[PDB]
Design a protein around this ligand. Structure first.
Ligand SMILES: CC(=O)N[C@@H]1[C@@H](O)[C@H](O[C@@H]2O[C@H](CO[C@H]3O[C@H](CO[C@H]4O[C@H](CO)[C@@H](O)[C@H](O)[C@@H]4O)[C@@H](O)[C@H](O[C@H]4O[C@H](CO)[C@@H](O)[C@H](O)[C@@H]4O)[C@@H]3O)[C@@H](O)[C@H](O[C@H]3O[C@H](CO)[C@@H](O)[C@H](O)[C@@H]3O[C@H]3O[C@H](CO)[C@@H](O)[C@H](O)[C@@H]3O[C@H]3O[C@H](CO)[C@@H](O)[C@H](O)[C@@H]3O)[C@@H]2O)[C@@H](CO)O[C@H]1O
Ligand SMILES: [Ca+2]
Length: 787
């Protein structure tokens, strides 16, 4: 049956039996059965029926072919049958706009769960079932003119997931392929992230150069992200043949340019980007699935010369290669046979992995091809007692986790049997290694012995963990695990330095995760002190063994097990210690005033709150006292409510929030705000954050308040509510009804000064002049004191 054949073809592609794949997009209006809206033939020269068996998958790419064209029935009743006979599957391509509301059936269904569920089935029926093909391919590119909304992308994802429940590896009809083709990187492809688990293949268009000297920069950096959603065996990259009359912006030069001296040049793949894509392989994950071409009906036509690359719709520079001609798919055939002859697609065999049990588990988890070995960078779990030898494991050079589970018949582990990534902190788990006799991990920079079930290694007769990065200190858990392995060797043999080697360790240094001093003290000694030196200092090992300074490190280096000193002799404190390079110390005085310095001079009784930062996060918080200390003041003005102002009531309110992300100013050089602290307490200092402290708009100091006065209601006897609004405002504007408690006469970025222990429920601050002719601004006002 014609459905059964396609079903078996699709299953063999999805199971990976074709080796590397070659696919091509066939433009429907270049099939000789295609007819336009006027019912006339567009191009008699080519037909999908002549596409050769070297094309594993042929995509139907639609334009200009009219809905009533004979092409559709010719495709369904004729092309599909003949292409199936040779092993070629057919896939229909549609654009994302068919799914997001913008075109086709998408315009006839609501953006609702049941509407999108119904849209997906109508799409599958119209574009897959009714057309007679073997799968669906959704084309998702950047829309330059009219960007797609998040709701448009969210819907296409929902429809795509519903399609994935109808067809594909996770759909009820598994005889159809489900594919995406895209121009979008992971960070710009939210639909890909959501659908990637349901996709058979991802076809990444890479027409034209992709950056760097080998022209594949974007492919490598894209693959570094793509690999987290799909397998390398699902990744196809694409080049374009030369399309007739292509203009600036659609001129890729992926094939060889016209040669008036050689009409066959377009059929020569030497030197072409197409050949490079055939040969390119990802550097992690595995080998790719293959390559594809856009416009396979133009296979073999030489590219228009580089001199034409500036022609446009309105600036035509027609060339002989713009003519339509019959193709015999020579370039497609060459590219496919190049790939299938690539020996990196030879299957892993007895000579890579001698042990057949080891070989089987590797193949099941890393892939079937020799080229997968050195690329696979995930996790390998080896289990069972059938594995006797680990030779060849060293070939998974980028494995990031190796897990040896109950390998009762493995007698030997050596660096030469281990992936190179073991020298770079790859994870190493081994459990139930009851047959292991030699455990050699020397020279691997292992930072701990964690994951090694030393209790089960009941047969150990020698080990060498020397030249690692271990902490074998008294308290270190790796010293304890070492002793178990020395006990295991003892049960079989007299211990010698050689059969229990553990010397020349170089443990790496780390920042302590916390610091002990939560409340420091200095005497009033009139001297400078460094808060980093005294309170936030030192280095730890991976096992959290603290080393405060250089002589603590000199003490550490003499550490020994059974008289053997394990720290390498040439290992220096400066190689181990953390420099505190980016560290900044943030100080809040009892003032509430803030500074950034690690140095304090203990001249008078004071209290700081200390936040130490590493450049990105706070690593430690503590209190520092100098002499008797000093009680932290509160901003008594915080949240005070505004009672009157010559400016805007609502902008006046913002000088009492907590932030400097606002400004208060008026249409002039002077203004005032009167405010009510609500309560009554003792004010000892005041602080004004000037215009240049604005955090929401970079503000120059010419807008600073330069003169001003902070004042108190100088009555205390009156009721504000007794006045009504107009006179209230007028009273509060009258200079006679306030007395100065502080004067300001410098346009400092932050102005702070003391008050003779003022206490007044009611306040008013007056700007009297500015740094310049500009209207003076300030952002925040503080009144600082007790209770
Ligand atoms: C996998 C891949 O590479 N994908 C793309 C690919 O698009 C691009 O190749 C180009 O594709 C163009 C087709 O895309 C446009 O049209 C489709 C079809 O939509 C119609 O049909 C649907 C079917 O149901 C309808 O539902 C739909 O509503 C339309 O009526 C659109 O789907 C498509 O969508 C766009 O927007 C979405 C938004 O999300 C986006 O995802 C898409 O990527 C796309 O941007 C587009 O609107 C195709 O037209 C291009 O070929 C033309 O230029 C070549 C040279 O550059 C030339 O060789 C070729 O023959 C075409 O030239 C004809 O068409 C021009 C535009 O109509 C005319 O100006 C020309 O004069 C010429 O027409 C003449 O000749 C033909 C016969 O040859 C004749 O029939 C005409 O009457 C006339 O005489 C190009 O192949 C690919 C390569 O760059 O990369 C990826 O972007
Ligand atoms: Ca403010």
């Amino acid at each position: 049956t014609d459905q059964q054949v396609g079903a078996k073809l699709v299953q063999e592609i999805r199971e990976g039996k074709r080796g590397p794949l070659y696919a091509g997009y066939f433009r429907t209006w270049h099939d000789r059965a295609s007819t336009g809206i006027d019912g006339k033939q567009q191009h008699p020269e080519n037909t999908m029926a002549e596409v050769p068996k070297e094309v594993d998958i042929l995509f139907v790419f639609h334009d200009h072919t009219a809905s009533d064209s004979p092409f559709w029935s010719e495709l369904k009743d004729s092309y599909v049958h003949k292409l199936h006979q040779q092993g070629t599957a057919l896939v229909q391509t549609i654009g994302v706009n068919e799914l997001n509301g913008r075109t086709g059936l998408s315009k006839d269904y609501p953006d609702t769960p049941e509407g999108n569920k119904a849209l997906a089935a109508a799409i599958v029926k119209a574009f897959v079932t009714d057309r007679g093909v073997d799968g669906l391919d959704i084309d998702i590119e950047h829309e330059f003119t009219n960007k797609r909304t998040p709701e448009e992308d969210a819907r296409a994802l929902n429809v795509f997931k519903e399609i994935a429940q109808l067809i594909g590896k996770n759909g009820s009809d598994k005889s159809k392929l489900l594919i995406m083709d895209t121009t979008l990187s992971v960070e710009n492809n939210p639909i890909f992230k959501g659908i990637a688990e349901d996709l058979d293949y991802l076809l990444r268009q890479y027409y034209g150069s992709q950056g760097g000297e080998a022209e594949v920069d974007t492919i490598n950096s894209d693959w570094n992200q793509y690999q987290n959603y799909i397998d390398a065996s699902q990744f196809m990259i694409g080049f374009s043949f030369f399309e007739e009359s292509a203009s600036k912006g659609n001129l890729w030069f992926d094939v060889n340019e016209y040669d008036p001296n050689n009409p066959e040049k377009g059929k020569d793949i030497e030197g072409t980007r197409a050949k490079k894509y055939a040969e390119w392989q990802p550097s992690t994950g595995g080998l790719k699935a293959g390559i594809f071409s856009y416009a396979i009906d133009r296979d073999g036509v030489a590219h228009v010369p580089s001199t034409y690359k500036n022609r446009t719709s309105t600036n035509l520079q027609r060339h002989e290669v713009d003519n339509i001609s019959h193709t015999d798919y020579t370039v497609s055939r060459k590219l496919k046979t190049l790939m299938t002859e690539d020996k990196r697609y030879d299957v892993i065999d007895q000579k890579d992995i001698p042990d057949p049990a080891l070989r089987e588990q590797i193949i099941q988890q890393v892939g079937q091809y020799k080229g997968d070995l050195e690329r696979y960078n995930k996790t390998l779990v080896l289990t069972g007692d059938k594995i006797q030898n680990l030779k060849g494991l060293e070939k998974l050079s980028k494995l990031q986790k190796l897990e040896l589970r109950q390998l009762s018949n493995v007698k030997e582990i050596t660096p030469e049997l281990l992936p190179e990534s073991m020298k770079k902190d790859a994870e190493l788990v081994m459990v139930g290694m009851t047959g292991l006799e030699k455990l050699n991990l020397s020279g691997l920079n292992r930072q701990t012995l964690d994951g090694i079930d030393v209790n089960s290694i009941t047969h150990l007769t020698s080990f060498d963990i020397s030249h690692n990065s271990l902490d074998l200190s008294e308290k270190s858990e790796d010293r304890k695990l070492l002793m178990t392995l020395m006990e295991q060797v003892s049960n079989h043999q007299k211990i010698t330095v050689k059969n229990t080697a553990f010397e020349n360790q170089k443990p790496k240094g780390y920042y302590p995760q916390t610091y002990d001093t939560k409340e420091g003290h200095y005497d009033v000694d009139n001297a400078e002190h460094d808060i980093l030196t005294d309170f936030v200092f030192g280095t730890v090992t991976k096992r959290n063994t603290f080393i405060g300074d250089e002589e603590a490190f000199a003490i550490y280096k003499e550490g020994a097990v059974d008289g053997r000193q394990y720290v390498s002799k040439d290992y220096t404190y400066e190689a181990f210690r953390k420099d505190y390079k980016g560290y900044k110390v943030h100080l809040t005085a009892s003032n509430l005033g803030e500074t950034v310095t690690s140095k304090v001079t203990a001249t008078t009784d004071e209290t700081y709150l200390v936040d130490v930062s590493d450049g990105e996060k706070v690593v430690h918080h503590m209190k520092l006292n100098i002499g008797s200390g000093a009680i932290m003041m509160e901003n008594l003005a915080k949240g005070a409510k505004v009672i009157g102002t010559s400016g805007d009531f609502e902008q006046a309110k913002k000088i009492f929030d907590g932030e400097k992300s606002d400004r208060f100013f008026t249409w002039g050089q002077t203004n005032w705000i009167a405010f009510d602290l609500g309560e009554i307490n003792l004010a000892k200092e005041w602080r004004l954050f000037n215009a240049e402290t604005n955090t929401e708009i970079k503000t120059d100091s010419s807008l600073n308040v330069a003169k001003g006065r902070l004042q108190i209601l100088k009555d205390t006897t009156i009721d504000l509510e007794k006045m009504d609004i107009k006179n209230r405002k007028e009273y509060l504007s009258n200079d006679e009804n306030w007395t100065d408690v502080a004067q300001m006469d410098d346009a400092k970025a932050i102005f702070n000064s003391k008050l003779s222990n003022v206490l007044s429920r009611y306040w008013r601050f007056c700007v009297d002049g500015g740094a310049s002719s500009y209207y003076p601004q300030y952002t925040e006002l503080q009144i600082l004191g007790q209770r």
